[PDB]
Design a protein around this ligand. Structure first.
Ligand code: MET
Ligand code: MET
Ligand code: NA
Ligand code: NA
Ligand code: NA
Ligand code: NA
Lengths: 252, 252
């Protein structure tokens, strides 16, 4: 028979430094772990064929990587798919084939309880002219600039939960921020870990989801969408969510 | 030049008899109207090419049609796309290319306020062994049978809001139902129209969305996903929702 085997699926995984229960490196094989990995693996198990595969970390592990640049590594055929907390953003859908979403997402505004008289949602945050914290690597920076008219110098990238919390604590007049804008799944973890001093203010002002980003015209995208919906109806997406994420805390 | 022109996009539209603000017939061109039509048209306007098209009603206009059978008309190449309140259901994703969802959906349980001591959610409804009302034509009938273990004789199809409300009023011992199981967008309208006697009980026990169902490998599916996300970020999906749907009512 023919000697040369098939190339495995090259899975690009963001090397998260913050909110690592969603996806992160693992010192043990397969070298990655977290909510989004367990969903991907559960969905692969439901496909009607084997999928030899390997997970490749993306990012220096000092700051969250650029997710736009991770998706463009799929477009450029360095990876076959991006697997993680990958938001289904308008520009990214022009060049990759996302699955149907495996979890809902959207942007929210987080501020101190004591500041919710002046910062009550995205509109008041916009007109405040004060600094806005965001994660490193998120779509949300360009979203705020292009869709919400935020002057770029107002946007302050922050490294990790310790810096999200210290920036909100200092506030807009002492070298911090008026608010953090971030997706609700992350903020659920932040509010679990910050002792009831911070809150969401106003509406979830966008609606999106996370998906796996395959190359254009990928048959795997089609079959993995069916598999995600099967996990959803089996209750497995909720069971996997409950394994990795818990938002209960001491101050209720 | 060549005389024979191109065939227009054949759009199959469910001829809804209930909840007609989502999609329904219109005595005026283009012969259909409602939330889902305005979203589809707004998304077509954003594509970078013209899409000559026509809307074709599906159903006798006496009862809501089978949505599985409407989707299978796309699979069988009688329509190019199904446009309306089309839930992204596991079996349908095996044969059509849905867009990314334009609205979130999920199943809920609706019961009288006075019955919420015995019917408190899907689990208690299951073990009650009482009759369950559903719409004509919905995925929810087979979902309840196959995913929730409901004996088929328990499921009672109902025609329209007058019959949804009368079945809940009669209740399970006088030729009615213990509860209605239906998707949250419909129940938001039902609760707008039923004078605070009924309520949702328990968790939204599934998570899905509505999408436009194109044929497999359709480039329009790809480009209409990008367009839906553009509408989402422009605020147009919310503006179109506010045009067609209002859930405020006299008893609050
Ligand atoms: C690195 S922060 C979170 C990234 C976000 N989910 C995105 O896809 O842009
Ligand atoms: C005719 S009731 C509602 C139908 C449902 N949205 C489906 O797609 O099955
Ligand atoms: Na894992
Ligand atoms: Na989406
Ligand atoms: Na219309
Ligand atoms: Na979906």
């Amino acid at each position: 028979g023919s000697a040369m085997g098939s190339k495995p699926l090259r899975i690009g995984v963001p090397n998260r430094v913050s909110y690592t229960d969603y996806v992160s490196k693992d010192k043990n094989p397969p070298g990655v772990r977290g909510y989004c990995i367990d969903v991907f693996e559960a969905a692969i198990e439901l496909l009607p064929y084997p999928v030899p595969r390997t997970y490749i970390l993306y990012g220096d592990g000092k700051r969250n990587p650029s997710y736009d640049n991770l998706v463009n590594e799929v477009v450029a055929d360095n990876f076959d798919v991006a697997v993680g907390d990958i938001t289904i953003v308008t520009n990214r859908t022009r060049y990759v084939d996302f699955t149907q979403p495996f979890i809902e997402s959207g942007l929210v505004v987080v501020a101190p309880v004591k500041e919710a008289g002046t910062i009550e949602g995205i509109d008041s945050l916009v007109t405040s002219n004060e600094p806005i914290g965001v994660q490193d690597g998120t779509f949300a920076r360009n979203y705020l600039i292009n869709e919400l008219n935020i002057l770029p110098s107002r946007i302050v990238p922050l490294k990790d939960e310790e810096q999200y919390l210290s920036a909100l604590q200092r506030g807009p007049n002492a070298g911090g921020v008026a608010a953090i804008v971030d997706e609700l799944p992350y903020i659920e973890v932040l509010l679990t870990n910050s002792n009831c001093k911070f809150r969401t203010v106003g509406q979830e002002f966008t609606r999106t989801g996370w998906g796996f980003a395959f190359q254009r015209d990928s048959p795997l995208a089609v079959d993995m969408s069916t598999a995600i919906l099967q996990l959803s109806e089996e209750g497995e997406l909720e069971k996997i969510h409950r394994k990795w994420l818990n938002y209960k805390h001491e101050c209720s």
